[model samples]
Target: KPVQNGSQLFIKELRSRTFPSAEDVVARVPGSQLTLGYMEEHGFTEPILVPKKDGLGLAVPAPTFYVSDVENYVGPERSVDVTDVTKQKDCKMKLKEFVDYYYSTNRKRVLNVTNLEFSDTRMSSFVEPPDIVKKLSWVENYWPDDALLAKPKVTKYCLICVKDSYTDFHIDSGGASAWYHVLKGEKTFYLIRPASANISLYERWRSASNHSEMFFADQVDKCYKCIVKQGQTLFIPSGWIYATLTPVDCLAFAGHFLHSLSVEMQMRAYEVERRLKLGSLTQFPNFETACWYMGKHLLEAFKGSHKSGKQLPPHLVQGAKILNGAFRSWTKKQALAEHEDELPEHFKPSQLIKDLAKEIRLSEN
Candidate 1:
C-alpha cells in the first residue's frame, strides 16, 4: 500500500474530526492524523461485527476492549522469553509454549517481553540482502559469508501496554537503539538532540536519578504520534522518552540490539595473551604494542580503572584471545610459506599479529 502523506495528516485541525469506524477514519483523514491519541480514543470505540448476546444486539466489544489484565497483572516479573529461535520450528515445544501463553492473554502484554524479536525477524521482510543492515558494522560481521546462513537472533524483546492515564517515559541503558512496532497499539515518542547539541539541558536531565520528569521538561517540541497498525515500524534512536495511551489493550514490540563487549570474554582473551608472552612462544611481539595503542586511543572508553592499570575485563580478554588466535592462524600460514623447510612440528603464526605489523608498516610508509 502506498504510504499516505504523513505531513498533511498530522495537522492539528485534521485530528479533531471523528469518523464512524477505524476504516472510515483512515479513509477520511490523512494517515498522519492517526496519532496515538486518535487510535487509543477512537479506534477502540469503532463498531465491528460480532456475535450477539441474544442474537438481537449483534455487536461485540472491540478486541482491544476485551483484553484481560490476566497477562499484565499476573506478572510478578514483567519480562519473559516466549520463543527460542535456535531450534526447529515444529520441534521447539518451549517456543510454542511461549506463543501459547502470550496468545492466551488474548491482548494483554505478554510474549517476547523485551521486544527484540521484531528487529531480528519482523524486519526480515523489509531487508534486502547484504545492504538491509548498514548502521551496525559490528553486528554485520557476525553474519557468515553466505547470506543464507546468516540468521538474526533475538537478543532481547519487550512489550509495554500503557493504559489510559499511564505513562512510561524512561531512558534505556547500554546505548540501545530500538525499533518500536505498533502491532496492536498506539504511542507518542518525544526526543531531544544529543547532549552536544544542548549540553546544559542534557546534563541537567542526566543529573536526575530518575530522568523521566527531566526528560519531559527538556523535551524537544518535535514530538510525534501515529496510529500504528500490524505491519508499521517505528525507529527509535537511543535516549528518547516514549509515552503511550490506550483504554483497551495496546500491544507494541520493542527490539534492543546489544553492542557492548562482554567483560568475561575480554578477560579470557587478555589471559591468553599474557600466557603466550610468558611461554616465550609469542609470535606477536606487537600484540602488547597494539593493546597499548588501542588503550591510548580508547582512553575515554576505559571507565573501570585508570590508577591501578588492572587487567582487561573478561569480555575484552575474550576479544583479545579471539584476536590473538586469528593473528596466530594467519602468521602460521605465512610461516609455512616463508620457512616451510625449517618450520616446527606445531608451528603456527598469528594473523592478528601479522595484521598489526602490516598496519605499523603502512603507518610508517
Candidate 2:
C-alpha cells in the first residue's frame, strides 16, 4: 500500500461520487442595491452573493489584493493558526513561512489560515469589513471603551487557503452574521439554512461520535452550493450552518458580527455553543458582557419610550424578552458563581433583569 497523507485522502473524498451537491444556488443581488438600511428593515434570511464590480459598494480590496501585501502589512513574523483539514488538527506558522509555502509548488497536504484577525495590524486599511457592519456589530456598537476585557477583534479576518482545503459545517460562534469577500482564487460554499428542523439535525450531527465520517448536508433536505468567484462578496445570516471547500489557492476577507436584526437567532446560537460546552476560546469573546450591555441599553430605550407615552416597536419588545430570558439563565446563582467576571463591574444585573421583564410585560398588553 502507498503511504498516503490526509490531504490526498481528503481530496479524493472531495472528488468522490459520495460528495453531494447543493439543491440550489444561493440568492444573488446587485451590490448597489444591498445596503445596511435595507438589510436591517427586511432582515437577512438567506445567503446572498453579489457579483464582482457591483460588490465594490462593500469594502472589498482591489483585485490586486495579494498575499505579499498581507505579509508586508500584517508583519511577516506574525503567527497564524493553520488548520489541517484532513487530520482535524491545527498548527501554527509565521506569515512569512506560509507566504513562501503558498506560492511554492510543494502541495504536500491541505493547510488553511482562516482566522487571521488583522484589524490591529497595518493591513487593517486594505481589508476592512463593510462599513455597515461596524455600525451594527455588537462589539462595535455596544462594548464600552473602559471595559475590563479586551474588545473582541473578530470583525477583520483574512483567510488564506490552499487548494483542497475544507472546513466542516458549523455556525459562526455567537450566532453572528458573516461576510466573505473572495479577493483571490475562489471558494465553493455548501450552505444549509437555519430552519428549526435543520438546526436540530445539525446539533445532533455535531455531537455524534462518527461526525467526521458523516456528510452533514446529506442528512438535510437541501444544501445550496454557492461558487463565490474572485471579487464576489457573500453575506450569510446568523445561525446558518455551512462549510467551505477551496478548489484553488484562495485569499479572502471575512468577518463575523452580532447585530440587532436577529437577536433571537444570536441567542439561539449562543445557547447551542453553551450546551455543547464550547469553551471561551471557541465561543464569542465576552458574549455575556455584551449581552449585559445590550440589556442595559434596551432598558434605557424602553424607559424613555414609556416616559414619552410612545409604544416601542414589536421587534424591540421581542428582543427585550429574549434578552430577559438569556439574562435570567446566565445570572442564575450557579452559573454566575463561575462566570461573575463576565458581568460588567458597574452593571446591576438584578435591576436590569427585573426592569426588562417589566417593560416586556407592559409592551405585551
lDDT string for model 1 (61-95, tens) is 23352123324333323233332211201122233
**Candidate 1 regions with alpha-carbon error over 4 angstroms:** 1-137, 143-160, 165-171, 198-203, 209-230, 238-248, 258-365
- TM, every model: 0.35, 0.91
Q: Write the per-residue lDDT of candidate 2 for residues 1-365, one digit (tens) a residue.
A: 33122356655665563434433445677776677776766677777677754543466568787888899999999998878777767888898988887787766767788888899998887665766677678788878898887777788889999888888889899998988988889998878889899988988888877676677877887777778998888888899999888888899998888888789999998888878775454467777777788888888888898789898878778888898888888889898886687888788789889888988888788
**Best-matching candidate per lDDT:** 2
RMSD of each: 19.7, 2.9
lDDT of each: 0.34, 0.80
Please report the candidate that would top TM-score against the real structure: 2
